[PDB]
Amino acid sequence: ETEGAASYFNSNNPRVDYKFFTVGDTTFVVNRTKIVRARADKTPAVGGTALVFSAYGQYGTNYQIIINGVKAAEYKTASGGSASDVETIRTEVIAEQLYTNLLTWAGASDYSISRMGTTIVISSLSGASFTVDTEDGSKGKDLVAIQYKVTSTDLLPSKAPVGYLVQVWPTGSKPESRYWLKAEAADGNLVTWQETLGADEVLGFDGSTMPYIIERTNIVGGIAQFTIKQGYWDDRAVGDELTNPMPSFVDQSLSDIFMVQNRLCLAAGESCIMSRTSYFFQFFRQTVLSAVDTDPIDVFADASEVYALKHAKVLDGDTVLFSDNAQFILPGDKPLTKATALLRPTTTFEVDTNVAPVVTGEAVMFATKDGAYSNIREFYTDSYSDTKKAQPVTSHVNKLIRGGIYHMASSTNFNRLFALSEDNRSRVFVYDWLWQGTDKVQSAWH
């Protein structure tokens, strides 16, 4: 066992609750009672820390640093008619002179101020935003004041403290193009920025409520050892809430687990989430700047009048998704992208989701419940060139099966089908069939 072992298996009717899945060696266990919750921790909010820097300098400019209203850190450049005024306009000279004046200011006892390169960094001591103004000779060329947002990429400071956060959102640009950048320590005068998660956002899924994993590590002395453990779910890394949103299945209960085109498929109620290709534990885009086909997909084309879907099966180039009152077809002709994958509601047959439908090759066999008996229907493709209908194969024997069906098993090589009934556990029904040409030369029950 592990942490949360005897807390995800808290149920009284495991037949309806626990739905299992298997890929490779790992085994996924899904409980339909718990509700997925988001983790309590959040990224730090928009900090009051701000930095200022100089770019050009000009001649004879009175440089101001308006720190939260009251004026401080004053400096003025000489006229420039003398050859010696060239030294006073350099960025480094401006930076150090402004730093010296700011430190001597009376209010400096509340803000931590340091100088690195041509950048002055002001950090609050348990306070709100500085709301700096920093008027200068030009419009924005001379001095640039940034707290957490910038209007372009060229205006980025040459130097910055390690771990500084900033928002990039050029004016007149689509909201999908904005992203958060992080200033990380590097050599050379220029600093390097990397994509990072936004400020004051939820980190990721809470592992205590997400489906668990059962894995067979090795075999010791002819006996395999099995380990149950929490899932290795990837955490959100890049983007903000708008461009990297939480999938809608949060604050809901899972319904089924399956997979299509090597992508894990989290189907919960109206929502179904497509995992990243070859990476089952990640549901968030690797990078927000650009979109690629491998990125996870969200498909909501199913109607909301259909409740939580239960089963999924493959049928002649398509994956059919079974609900309690309708069916859907997910096309597989084209690769699934953000603009191509969609659910197509095709048939409205009445299907009982208590028992798992089986596949017999070219057809899918599902059972329906009615009264104290049960019928079994065949799902196949008709002679219309892509239209599917369902027909009952228990027409001549409909009262044979007592109670309902709780288990099925098929055999494509033997063309054999098995069924069970609750009214007598000792009785098993065998349905045999054999296609030949275009007709069923045999359809046997015993």
* Token couple for 105: 């200011």
- The CA distance from 51 to 102, in Å, is 13
Can you give the C-alpha Rg of the chain in angstroms? 33
Determine the Cα angle at 392 with ends 389 and 395, to 5°.
150
Q: Are 98 and 88 in contact (CB under 8 A)?
A: no
Query: Which phi and psi (to 5°) does residue 60 adopt?
Result: 60, 45
Q: Who's near 358: CB < 8 A, 6+ residues apart?
A: 364, 365, 366, 408, 409, 410, 417
Ranges of beta strands (E only) in 261-387 are: 263-268, 271-274, 297-299, 311-315, 318-322, 327-331, 344-345, 358-359, 364-370, 373-381
Q: Are 309 and 322 in contact (CB under 8 A)?
A: yes
The DSSP secondary-structure symbol of 317 reads T
* Separation of first and last alpha carbons in the chain: 45
- The CA distance from 207 to 37, in Å, is 9
Tell me which H or E stretch contains 228. Answer: strand 223-230
Q: What is the DSSP string of 257-294?
A: EEEETTEEEEEETTEEEEPBTTBTT--S-S-SSS--TT
The resolution in Å comes to: 4.0
Strands 164-168 and 149-150: parallel
Cβ neighbours, 10 Å, residue 311:
22
Q: How far is CA 329 from CA 82, 168, 323, 365, in A?
A: 82, 41, 11, 16
Q: Are 311 and 322 in contact (CB under 8 A)?
A: yes
Q: Are 167 and 180 in contact (CB under 8 A)?
A: yes
Strands 388-392 and 373-381: antiparallel
Determine the Cα angle at 301 with ends 299 and 303, to 5°.
135
* Token couple for 190: 């220029």
Q: How far is CA 328 from CA 342, 348, 372, 375, in A?
A: 10, 9, 28, 22
Q: What is the DSSP string of 193-216?
A: EEEEBPSS-B--B-TTTSPEEEEE
Cβ burial, residue 314 (10 Å; 0-12/13-18/19+)? middle
In the chain, count H helices and then E strands: 3, 30
The SS3 of residue 302 is coil
Amino acid present at 158: S
- The CA distance from 49 to 111, in Å, is 9
- The CA distance from 196 to 275, in Å, is 21
Cβ neighbours, 10 Å, residue 181:
19
Q: Are 153 and 167 in contact (CB under 8 A)?
A: no
